[PDB]
Short mmCIF file of C-alpha atoms and ligand atoms in Angstrom, two decimals:
data_model
loop_
_atom_site.label_atom_id
_atom_site.label_comp_id
_atom_site.label_asym_id
_atom_site.label_seq_id
_atom_site.Cartn_x
_atom_site.Cartn_y
_atom_site.Cartn_z
CA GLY A 1 -194.14 -48.86 43.93
CA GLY A 2 -194.73 -52.15 42.19
CA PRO A 3 -196.76 -54.41 39.04
CA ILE A 4 -200.67 -53.16 38.97
CA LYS A 5 -201.73 -56.44 37.99
CA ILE A 6 -199.70 -60.12 37.41
CA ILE A 7 -200.79 -61.85 33.93
CA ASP A 8 -201.67 -65.35 34.29
CA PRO A 9 -199.51 -67.41 31.42
CA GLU A 10 -202.60 -69.76 31.30
CA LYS A 11 -204.79 -67.42 29.79
CA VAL A 12 -202.71 -65.46 27.11
CA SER A 13 -204.85 -66.03 24.48
CA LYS A 14 -203.14 -67.87 21.38
CA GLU A 15 -205.04 -66.22 19.01
CA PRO A 16 -205.80 -62.26 18.28
CA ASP A 17 -208.97 -60.63 18.12
CA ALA A 18 -211.12 -59.70 15.44
CA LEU A 19 -210.32 -56.70 13.17
CA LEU A 20 -212.61 -54.03 10.74
CA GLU A 21 -214.00 -55.98 7.95
CA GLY A 22 -211.45 -56.22 5.10
CA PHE A 23 -207.93 -55.78 6.98
CA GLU A 24 -205.51 -58.13 9.10
CA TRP A 25 -203.04 -58.92 11.50
CA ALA A 26 -199.63 -59.69 9.60
CA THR A 27 -196.20 -59.44 11.46
CA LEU A 28 -193.63 -57.54 10.00
CA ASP A 29 -190.39 -58.96 9.56
CA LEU A 30 -187.75 -56.00 8.85
CA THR A 31 -184.77 -57.94 7.77
CA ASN A 32 -186.67 -58.16 4.28
CA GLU A 33 -185.95 -55.05 2.38
CA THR A 34 -189.75 -54.56 0.52
CA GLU A 35 -191.35 -55.15 4.63
CA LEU A 36 -189.20 -52.39 5.67
CA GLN A 37 -190.10 -50.09 2.76
CA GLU A 38 -193.97 -51.08 3.48
CA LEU A 39 -193.46 -49.64 6.92
CA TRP A 40 -191.38 -46.54 5.96
CA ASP A 41 -193.75 -45.90 2.63
CA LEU A 42 -196.99 -45.71 6.05
CA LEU A 43 -195.01 -43.31 8.36
CA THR A 44 -193.29 -41.45 5.85
CA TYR A 45 -197.15 -40.22 4.88
CA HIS A 46 -198.75 -40.83 8.43
CA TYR A 47 -196.49 -40.42 11.37
CA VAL A 48 -196.62 -37.58 13.63
CA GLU A 49 -196.90 -34.58 12.60
CA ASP A 50 -197.25 -30.73 14.54
CA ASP A 51 -200.38 -28.97 15.08
CA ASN A 52 -199.88 -26.13 12.46
CA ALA A 53 -199.94 -29.36 9.70
CA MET A 54 -196.42 -27.97 8.43
CA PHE A 55 -193.71 -30.69 9.56
CA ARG A 56 -194.13 -34.89 9.80
CA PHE A 57 -191.29 -36.63 11.70
CA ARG A 58 -189.20 -38.62 8.82
CA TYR A 59 -187.58 -41.81 10.45
CA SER A 60 -185.35 -43.20 7.69
CA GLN A 61 -185.22 -46.67 6.76
CA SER A 62 -182.19 -47.30 8.46
CA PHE A 63 -183.04 -45.74 11.45
CA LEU A 64 -186.61 -47.62 11.77
CA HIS A 65 -183.12 -50.55 10.71
CA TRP A 66 -181.37 -49.35 14.07
CA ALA A 67 -184.33 -48.61 16.42
CA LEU A 68 -186.75 -51.86 15.26
CA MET A 69 -184.00 -54.87 15.94
CA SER A 70 -181.89 -53.91 18.55
CA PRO A 71 -180.76 -55.94 21.36
CA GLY A 72 -183.12 -58.77 22.10
CA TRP A 73 -185.54 -58.13 19.46
CA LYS A 74 -188.29 -60.56 18.27
CA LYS A 75 -190.58 -60.19 14.76
CA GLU A 76 -193.66 -60.67 16.84
CA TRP A 77 -193.26 -57.30 18.06
CA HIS A 78 -193.13 -55.88 14.83
CA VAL A 79 -197.12 -55.75 14.18
CA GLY A 80 -199.04 -54.51 11.10
CA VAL A 81 -202.14 -54.87 9.58
CA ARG A 82 -202.88 -55.34 6.29
CA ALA A 83 -205.80 -54.81 3.85
CA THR A 84 -206.94 -58.12 2.81
CA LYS A 85 -207.42 -57.99 -0.79
CA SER A 86 -204.56 -55.37 -1.43
CA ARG A 87 -202.14 -56.18 0.93
CA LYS A 88 -201.60 -52.57 1.61
CA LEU A 89 -199.84 -52.11 4.80
CA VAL A 90 -202.66 -49.95 6.92
CA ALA A 91 -200.81 -49.65 10.62
CA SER A 92 -198.46 -50.73 12.83
CA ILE A 93 -197.71 -50.75 16.46
CA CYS A 94 -193.90 -52.22 17.44
CA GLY A 95 -191.83 -53.20 20.32
CA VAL A 96 -187.94 -53.77 21.45
CA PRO A 97 -186.85 -54.83 24.53
CA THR A 98 -184.69 -53.22 27.01
CA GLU A 99 -184.77 -53.42 31.04
CA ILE A 100 -185.00 -50.01 33.01
CA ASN A 101 -184.77 -48.55 36.21
CA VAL A 102 -187.93 -47.67 38.42
CA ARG A 103 -186.99 -45.87 42.23
CA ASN A 104 -183.50 -48.15 41.99
CA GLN A 105 -186.61 -52.00 40.96
CA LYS A 106 -185.06 -53.46 37.56
CA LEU A 107 -187.95 -54.23 35.36
CA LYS A 108 -187.55 -55.88 32.53
CA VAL A 109 -189.98 -54.20 29.80
CA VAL A 110 -191.31 -53.29 25.95
CA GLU A 111 -190.21 -49.72 24.86
CA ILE A 112 -192.70 -49.13 22.61
CA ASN A 113 -192.98 -46.76 19.69
CA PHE A 114 -194.38 -46.64 15.56
CA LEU A 115 -198.04 -46.19 16.46
CA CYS A 116 -199.63 -45.51 13.23
CA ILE A 117 -203.34 -45.33 11.16
CA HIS A 118 -204.08 -44.99 7.94
CA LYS A 119 -205.22 -41.31 7.99
CA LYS A 120 -208.60 -42.91 5.85
CA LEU A 121 -208.48 -45.11 8.96
CA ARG A 122 -208.62 -42.72 11.16
CA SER A 123 -211.19 -42.33 14.58
CA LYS A 124 -212.22 -45.92 13.98
CA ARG A 125 -210.99 -47.20 17.32
CA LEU A 126 -208.65 -49.20 15.76
CA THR A 127 -205.46 -47.68 17.64
CA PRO A 128 -206.86 -49.83 21.29
CA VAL A 129 -207.26 -53.02 19.14
CA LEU A 130 -203.43 -52.56 17.87
CA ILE A 131 -202.54 -51.85 22.26
CA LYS A 132 -204.19 -55.18 23.09
CA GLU A 133 -202.78 -57.35 20.19
CA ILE A 134 -199.22 -56.21 20.88
CA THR A 135 -199.89 -56.77 24.91
CA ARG A 136 -200.75 -59.98 24.33
CA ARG A 137 -197.92 -60.69 21.83
CA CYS A 138 -195.90 -59.13 24.41
CA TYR A 139 -197.74 -61.18 26.83
CA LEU A 140 -196.62 -64.73 25.63
CA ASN A 141 -193.22 -63.60 25.79
CA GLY A 142 -192.81 -63.18 29.38
CA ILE A 143 -193.18 -59.16 28.71
CA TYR A 144 -196.35 -57.65 31.35
CA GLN A 145 -195.13 -54.00 31.69
CA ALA A 146 -194.12 -51.09 29.16
CA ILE A 147 -193.04 -47.62 28.81
CA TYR A 148 -193.61 -45.13 25.64
CA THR A 149 -193.65 -41.70 25.60
CA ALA A 150 -196.74 -39.38 23.52
CA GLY A 151 -197.27 -35.85 23.08
CA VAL A 152 -201.39 -36.50 24.00
CA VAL A 153 -202.08 -37.02 27.59
CA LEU A 154 -203.14 -40.22 28.74
CA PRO A 155 -204.20 -41.50 32.01
CA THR A 156 -201.22 -41.55 35.04
CA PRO A 157 -197.97 -39.64 33.38
CA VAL A 158 -195.14 -40.86 35.14
CA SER A 159 -193.41 -37.18 33.58
CA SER A 160 -193.47 -34.23 31.33
CA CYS A 161 -190.64 -33.04 29.58
CA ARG A 162 -190.17 -30.17 27.68
CA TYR A 163 -188.81 -29.75 24.00
CA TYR A 164 -186.00 -27.31 23.20
CA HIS A 165 -184.44 -26.40 19.80
CA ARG A 166 -180.85 -25.01 18.98
CA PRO A 167 -180.84 -23.43 15.57
CA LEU A 168 -177.53 -24.14 13.69
CA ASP A 169 -178.35 -23.28 10.34
CA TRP A 170 -181.21 -20.12 11.35
CA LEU A 171 -181.52 -19.52 7.43
CA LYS A 172 -182.42 -22.62 7.08
CA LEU A 173 -184.97 -23.12 9.26
CA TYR A 174 -186.52 -19.76 9.10
CA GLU A 175 -187.55 -20.16 4.93
CA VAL A 176 -189.00 -23.55 6.37
CA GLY A 177 -191.11 -21.70 9.04
CA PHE A 178 -189.89 -23.57 11.59
CA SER A 179 -187.59 -20.73 12.99
CA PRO A 180 -189.09 -16.87 13.29
CA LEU A 181 -187.82 -13.83 12.54
CA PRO A 182 -188.75 -11.41 16.12
CA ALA A 183 -190.31 -7.94 14.65
CA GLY A 184 -187.22 -6.37 15.92
CA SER A 185 -184.58 -8.16 13.98
CA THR A 186 -182.89 -9.25 10.89
CA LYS A 187 -181.28 -12.04 8.74
CA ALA A 188 -178.19 -11.47 10.11
CA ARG A 189 -179.03 -10.80 13.49
CA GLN A 190 -180.70 -14.18 13.96
CA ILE A 191 -177.56 -15.24 11.64
CA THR A 192 -174.78 -13.79 14.58
CA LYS A 193 -177.13 -15.39 17.59
CA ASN A 194 -176.88 -18.38 16.38
CA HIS A 195 -172.93 -18.84 15.14
CA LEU A 196 -170.89 -21.11 16.79
CA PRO A 197 -167.12 -21.56 16.73
CA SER A 198 -165.46 -23.44 13.94
CA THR A 199 -163.33 -25.90 16.29
CA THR A 200 -164.78 -27.71 19.55
CA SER A 201 -162.90 -26.96 22.91
CA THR A 202 -162.73 -29.98 25.06
CA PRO A 203 -158.99 -31.90 25.55
CA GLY A 204 -159.39 -35.26 24.23
CA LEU A 205 -162.50 -35.08 22.64
CA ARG A 206 -162.49 -37.64 19.03
CA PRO A 207 -165.15 -40.68 17.80
CA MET A 208 -166.28 -43.33 19.46
CA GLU A 209 -164.49 -46.16 18.92
CA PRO A 210 -165.55 -49.96 19.43
CA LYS A 211 -162.53 -50.04 21.99
CA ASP A 212 -164.20 -47.33 23.97
CA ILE A 213 -167.65 -49.53 24.83
CA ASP A 214 -166.65 -51.07 28.50
CA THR A 215 -165.77 -47.56 29.62
CA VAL A 216 -168.75 -45.85 28.22
CA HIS A 217 -170.98 -48.63 29.45
CA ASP A 218 -169.08 -48.09 32.93
CA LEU A 219 -170.10 -44.83 33.01
CA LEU A 220 -173.20 -44.25 31.49
CA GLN A 221 -174.97 -46.77 33.72
CA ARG A 222 -173.38 -44.60 36.88
CA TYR A 223 -173.81 -41.67 35.38
CA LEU A 224 -178.06 -43.09 34.78
CA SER A 225 -178.20 -44.40 38.36
CA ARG A 226 -178.25 -41.05 39.21
CA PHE A 227 -181.84 -40.79 37.78
CA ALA A 228 -185.01 -42.28 39.89
CA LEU A 229 -185.87 -43.57 36.34
CA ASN A 230 -183.50 -44.66 34.07
CA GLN A 231 -182.44 -47.01 31.17
CA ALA A 232 -180.23 -50.05 32.26
CA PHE A 233 -177.56 -50.13 29.50
CA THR A 234 -176.19 -54.18 28.42
CA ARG A 235 -172.55 -54.28 26.52
CA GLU A 236 -174.55 -55.28 23.73
CA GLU A 237 -176.99 -51.77 23.74
CA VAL A 238 -173.57 -49.68 24.53
CA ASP A 239 -172.42 -51.19 21.22
CA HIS A 240 -176.02 -51.09 18.73
CA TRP A 241 -177.19 -48.45 20.31
CA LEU A 242 -173.74 -45.59 20.18
CA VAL A 243 -171.28 -47.58 18.10
CA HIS A 244 -172.10 -46.59 14.55
CA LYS A 245 -171.21 -49.34 12.28
CA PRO A 246 -169.73 -47.97 8.82
CA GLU A 247 -168.94 -51.22 6.64
CA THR A 248 -173.04 -52.37 7.79
CA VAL A 249 -174.86 -48.76 7.87
CA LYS A 250 -175.17 -46.69 4.92
CA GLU A 251 -176.79 -44.14 6.31
CA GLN A 252 -175.44 -42.82 9.85
CA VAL A 253 -178.12 -42.69 12.33
CA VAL A 254 -175.46 -42.35 15.54
CA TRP A 255 -173.34 -40.11 16.35
CA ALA A 256 -171.06 -40.69 19.28
CA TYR A 257 -167.70 -39.04 20.53
CA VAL A 258 -165.71 -39.77 23.78
CA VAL A 259 -162.98 -37.26 25.33
CA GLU A 260 -159.83 -39.14 26.54
CA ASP A 261 -158.41 -37.54 28.89
CA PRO A 262 -155.03 -36.15 27.54
CA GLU A 263 -153.24 -37.04 31.01
CA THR A 264 -154.16 -40.29 32.29
CA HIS A 265 -155.97 -41.40 28.62
CA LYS A 266 -159.45 -42.37 30.57
CA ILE A 267 -162.71 -41.82 28.67
CA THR A 268 -163.94 -38.63 31.38
CA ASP A 269 -167.14 -37.80 29.44
CA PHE A 270 -169.56 -38.62 26.32
CA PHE A 271 -172.50 -37.66 24.86
CA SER A 272 -174.14 -38.98 21.38
CA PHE A 273 -176.82 -37.65 18.91
CA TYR A 274 -179.35 -39.07 16.79
CA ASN A 275 -180.43 -38.21 12.67
CA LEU A 276 -184.05 -37.48 12.59
CA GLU A 277 -185.24 -36.00 9.15
CA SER A 278 -188.59 -34.24 9.19
CA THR A 279 -190.89 -33.74 5.81
CA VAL A 280 -191.63 -29.97 5.14
CA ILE A 281 -194.75 -30.79 3.99
CA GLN A 282 -196.09 -27.70 2.12
CA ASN A 283 -192.70 -25.36 1.04
CA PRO A 284 -191.28 -23.82 -2.35
CA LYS A 285 -187.55 -23.77 -1.04
CA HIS A 286 -186.97 -26.66 0.87
CA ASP A 287 -188.14 -31.06 1.54
CA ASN A 288 -187.12 -31.29 4.85
CA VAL A 289 -184.80 -30.21 7.90
CA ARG A 290 -182.56 -32.42 9.28
CA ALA A 291 -182.88 -32.69 12.91
CA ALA A 292 -180.23 -33.51 15.19
CA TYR A 293 -181.57 -35.21 18.93
CA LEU A 294 -179.25 -35.07 21.88
CA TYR A 295 -179.21 -39.07 23.48
CA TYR A 296 -176.92 -40.25 26.08
CA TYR A 297 -174.19 -38.75 27.31
CA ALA A 298 -171.80 -39.09 30.81
CA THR A 299 -169.46 -36.69 32.80
CA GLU A 300 -167.16 -37.76 35.78
CA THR A 301 -167.79 -34.00 36.78
CA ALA A 302 -171.29 -34.88 38.17
CA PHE A 303 -169.73 -37.14 40.33
CA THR A 304 -168.63 -34.36 42.81
CA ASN A 305 -172.04 -33.08 43.41
CA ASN A 306 -171.04 -29.95 43.14
CA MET A 307 -173.21 -28.88 40.34
CA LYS A 308 -171.68 -25.73 39.19
CA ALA A 309 -168.55 -27.74 38.04
CA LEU A 310 -170.68 -29.86 36.34
CA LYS A 311 -172.89 -26.54 35.28
CA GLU A 312 -169.34 -25.69 33.54
CA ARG A 313 -168.65 -29.38 32.08
CA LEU A 314 -171.71 -29.72 29.94
CA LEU A 315 -171.42 -26.25 28.87
CA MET A 316 -168.58 -27.08 27.12
CA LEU A 317 -169.17 -30.65 26.33
CA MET A 318 -172.73 -30.01 25.08
CA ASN A 319 -171.22 -26.88 22.84
CA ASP A 320 -168.88 -29.33 21.14
CA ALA A 321 -171.88 -31.32 20.67
CA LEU A 322 -173.59 -28.18 18.88
CA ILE A 323 -170.66 -27.40 16.66
CA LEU A 324 -169.76 -31.27 15.77
CA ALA A 325 -173.70 -31.34 14.77
CA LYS A 326 -173.04 -28.74 12.31
CA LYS A 327 -169.99 -29.54 11.00
CA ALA A 328 -171.94 -32.85 9.76
CA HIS A 329 -174.53 -30.12 8.41
CA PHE A 330 -177.92 -30.84 10.51
CA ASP A 331 -180.08 -27.57 10.55
CA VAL A 332 -181.13 -27.75 14.42
CA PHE A 333 -180.02 -29.47 17.30
CA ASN A 334 -182.69 -30.66 19.68
CA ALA A 335 -183.00 -31.65 23.00
CA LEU A 336 -185.59 -32.47 26.02
CA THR A 337 -185.36 -31.45 29.74
CA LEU A 338 -184.53 -34.44 30.86
CA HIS A 339 -181.71 -35.91 32.33
CA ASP A 340 -179.46 -32.26 33.37
CA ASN A 341 -180.47 -30.39 30.53
CA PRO A 342 -181.80 -28.10 32.02
CA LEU A 343 -178.06 -26.93 33.40
CA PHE A 344 -176.89 -25.63 29.45
CA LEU A 345 -180.40 -25.58 27.26
CA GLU A 346 -181.21 -21.45 28.06
CA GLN A 347 -177.53 -20.90 27.90
CA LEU A 348 -176.44 -22.24 24.53
CA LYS A 349 -179.75 -20.54 23.42
CA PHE A 350 -182.02 -23.35 22.53
CA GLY A 351 -185.14 -21.82 22.35
CA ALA A 352 -188.33 -23.73 24.06
CA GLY A 353 -190.71 -25.62 22.11
CA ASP A 354 -194.22 -26.21 21.80
CA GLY A 355 -195.88 -27.80 24.67
CA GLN A 356 -194.33 -31.40 26.35
CA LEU A 357 -193.82 -35.05 25.79
CA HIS A 358 -195.25 -37.10 27.94
CA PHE A 359 -193.78 -40.37 30.04
CA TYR A 360 -195.45 -43.72 30.37
CA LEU A 361 -195.49 -46.71 31.99
CA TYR A 362 -197.97 -49.95 32.07
CA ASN A 363 -198.74 -52.27 34.19
CA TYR A 364 -196.26 -50.49 36.59
CA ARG A 365 -197.32 -48.21 39.78
CA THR A 366 -194.91 -45.35 41.02
CA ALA A 367 -195.07 -41.75 41.93
CA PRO A 368 -194.32 -39.22 39.34
CA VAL A 369 -190.78 -38.21 39.06
CA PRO A 370 -189.56 -34.97 37.47
CA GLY A 371 -188.97 -33.86 34.37
CA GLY A 372 -186.84 -31.48 34.17
CA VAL A 373 -189.45 -28.52 34.60
CA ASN A 374 -191.05 -26.05 37.40
CA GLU A 375 -195.07 -25.08 37.46
CA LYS A 376 -194.56 -22.55 33.86
CA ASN A 377 -192.55 -25.43 32.04
CA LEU A 378 -189.22 -23.79 32.14
CA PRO A 379 -185.93 -25.84 32.80
CA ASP A 380 -185.43 -25.59 36.32
CA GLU A 381 -182.28 -27.34 38.00
CA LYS A 382 -184.02 -27.94 41.09
CA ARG A 383 -186.66 -30.60 39.32
CA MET A 384 -184.09 -32.57 37.79
CA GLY A 385 -183.02 -36.35 38.72
CA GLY A 386 -186.09 -37.90 37.36
CA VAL A 387 -185.86 -38.67 33.91
CA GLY A 388 -182.66 -40.73 32.72
CA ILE A 389 -184.28 -42.32 29.38
CA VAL A 390 -184.74 -41.38 26.03
CA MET A 391 -186.64 -43.04 23.62
CA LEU A 392 -186.49 -42.45 19.91
C1 LIG B 401 -196.85 -55.54 28.21
C2 LIG B 401 -196.70 -54.93 27.28
C3 LIG B 401 -197.78 -54.15 27.05
C4 LIG B 401 -197.25 -52.88 25.63
C5 LIG B 401 -198.84 -51.99 24.87
C6 LIG B 401 -198.54 -51.14 26.00
C7 LIG B 401 -199.28 -49.39 25.80
C8 LIG B 401 -198.53 -48.93 24.51
C9 LIG B 401 -199.86 -47.93 24.07
C10 LIG B 401 -199.39 -47.33 22.70
C11 LIG B 401 -197.93 -46.24 22.50
C12 LIG B 401 -198.10 -45.35 21.95
C13 LIG B 401 -197.10 -44.73 21.88
C14 LIG B 401 -196.37 -44.02 20.76
O1 LIG B 401 -195.80 -44.60 19.32
S1 LIG B 401 -196.66 -42.05 20.00
C15 LIG B 401 -197.04 -41.92 18.26
C16 LIG B 401 -198.42 -42.06 18.05
N1 LIG B 401 -198.77 -42.13 16.67
C17 LIG B 401 -199.00 -40.66 16.27
O2 LIG B 401 -199.43 -39.41 16.56
C18 LIG B 401 -199.04 -40.73 14.67
C19 LIG B 401 -199.78 -40.06 13.79
N2 LIG B 401 -201.35 -40.48 14.47
C20 LIG B 401 -201.97 -42.02 13.78
O3 LIG B 401 -201.32 -42.91 13.39
C21 LIG B 401 -203.31 -42.30 14.82
O4 LIG B 401 -203.40 -40.53 15.13
C22 LIG B 401 -203.22 -42.91 16.66
C23 LIG B 401 -202.42 -44.06 15.83
C24 LIG B 401 -201.86 -42.18 17.17
C25 LIG B 401 -203.89 -42.82 16.99
O5 LIG B 401 -205.45 -43.49 15.91
P1 LIG B 401 -206.92 -42.75 15.59
O6 LIG B 401 -206.80 -41.22 15.90
O7 LIG B 401 -207.55 -43.42 14.95
O8 LIG B 401 -207.61 -43.16 17.42
P2 LIG B 401 -208.87 -44.24 17.58
O9 LIG B 401 -210.22 -44.07 16.92
O10 LIG B 401 -208.13 -45.79 16.47
O11 LIG B 401 -208.36 -44.63 19.04
C26 LIG B 401 -208.67 -43.90 19.53
C27 LIG B 401 -208.32 -44.09 21.70
O12 LIG B 401 -206.67 -44.67 21.19
C28 LIG B 401 -206.11 -43.69 21.87
N3 LIG B 401 -204.44 -42.35 21.32
C29 LIG B 401 -204.82 -41.67 20.90
N4 LIG B 401 -203.42 -41.87 20.41
C30 LIG B 401 -202.46 -42.34 20.87
C31 LIG B 401 -201.61 -42.43 21.15
N5 LIG B 401 -200.55 -41.75 21.12
N6 LIG B 401 -201.28 -43.30 22.22
C32 LIG B 401 -201.73 -44.61 23.27
N7 LIG B 401 -202.86 -43.88 23.07
C33 LIG B 401 -203.62 -43.20 21.87
C34 LIG B 401 -207.33 -41.59 22.09
O13 LIG B 401 -207.13 -41.74 23.80
C35 LIG B 401 -208.33 -42.79 22.87
O14 LIG B 401 -208.82 -43.75 23.35
P3 LIG B 401 -210.39 -43.58 24.39
O15 LIG B 401 -210.85 -42.91 23.95
O16 LIG B 401 -210.40 -45.62 24.19
O17 LIG B 401 -209.90 -44.08 25.74
C1 LIG B 402 -189.46 -30.05 13.15
C2 LIG B 402 -191.12 -30.96 13.91
N1 LIG B 402 -191.18 -32.63 13.09
C3 LIG B 402 -192.21 -32.93 13.12
C4 LIG B 402 -193.42 -32.51 14.08
C5 LIG B 402 -192.93 -31.89 14.77
C6 LIG B 402 -191.54 -30.57 14.38
C7 LIG B 402 -191.78 -29.63 15.31
O1 LIG B 402 -190.79 -29.10 15.66
C8 LIG B 402 -190.02 -30.00 16.71
C9 LIG B 402 -188.89 -30.36 16.53
C10 LIG B 402 -188.19 -31.10 17.67
C11 LIG B 402 -189.26 -31.70 18.78
C12 LIG B 402 -188.57 -32.98 19.65
C13 LIG B 402 -187.65 -32.38 19.79
C14 LIG B 402 -186.79 -33.13 20.38
C15 LIG B 402 -187.19 -34.87 21.04
C16 LIG B 402 -188.85 -35.20 20.18
C17 LIG B 402 -189.35 -36.30 20.87
C18 LIG B 402 -188.11 -37.51 20.24
C19 LIG B 402 -188.49 -38.76 20.92
N2 LIG B 402 -190.42 -39.14 20.19
C20 LIG B 402 -190.87 -37.56 20.52
C21 LIG B 402 -190.53 -36.37 19.82
C22 LIG B 402 -189.22 -33.64 19.26
C23 LIG B 402 -190.95 -31.77 18.01
C24 LIG B 402 -190.67 -31.02 17.47
#
């Protein structure tokens, strides 16, 4: 594998291409509360929905602040389109920098997300224009590769993973149409099936602290090394992406927990999950779904190559994650079939979701990597070791 083309730093245009009449390019400054609000306004009403128009992802302003001003970020990579007259923000596309490992080669990339066009401007071929412009801004800063996900099929996906959903408040999810009541059942039986213990079981389990950063950093990168495609975490990235800062962040977005061994007092495990609401588009009884998403995790047990033992360890840890997520009043716990997740998704009663999330690399060729599933789109322990990066 390797890059597809070499970019000529001399030929990168200093000026952007033209836009549809009445619109103009605009760099967003997300340290400005009004501009953060503008992006949130756009996304809230125009970002990704399900195919039945029942739900729309509802990234919080705190989430956007977190996701988009990560270590190394540049405002030049927060790209907006405005209406010239009204000044209204009508489109966005965003990137942040990170390093990834693609089959043992380290690569500097941008992670691309929050591509969004106002519904009234759809189907006008603006998306290629947005893509080309963020590409140009990246090129100017010496970045020539990207990684991203999408639910739509685009040329040469590097992998695909299925969505999985673990009901925490099943009744909530029933009343919003998220979860069905099967023909043969009752509310009580569904609540029974999804019931969770009142307390966690892993000994030594506690919220991650800043003092844990170095140890979690070491453990995480050793664990992610087990995957063909993975994120090459820096220390500042562990701090930013895993350690909630309550003093300066009003609405918590990231939860992290470590296992401090009772005997050695070393960190032997950790897991984490983030808060991403969905808007319930039209419902009498509810306005939102409060969802938690599984993010990064690691365990020393992985390094024995004893899959039964890894399976056992993950079943306990991930059930603890559910209980903690429930305690934090999340309605549902979501995950993908990446990492070692096929080892626990079905047994801990995650229900299979619809379709796949596809993973893409820009300007980089590599062989497809396994995404946790077989040909039937079902979790498969023999199809792991592939995708070791979670994106937002
Ligand atoms: C070196 C640095 C490189 C950095 C850049 C790397 C590449 C980054 C790539 C971007 C990563 C984004 C990652 C995320 O954020 S994925 C999230 C995408 N956002 C949404 O789903 C929000 C709801 N939808 C919308 O806002 C619009 O429907 C969007 C903007 C998605 C399409 O707007 P619209 O419906 O008005 O379409 P058009 O008439 O302007 O354009 C039609 C063309 O656009 C292609 N299209 C449609 N959907 C996507 C999609 N999700 N990824 C890439 N391409 C897409 C489509 O195949 C067609 O191509 P073609 O027929 O010409 O082949
Ligand atoms: C509840 C909801 N909100 C917005 C759109 C669709 C839906 C439907 O139910 C879903 C519940 C969960 C997911 C989901 C689960 C795990 C990972 C993801 C990725 C997370 C990164 N961005 C792409 C989606 C989505 C997708 C859909």
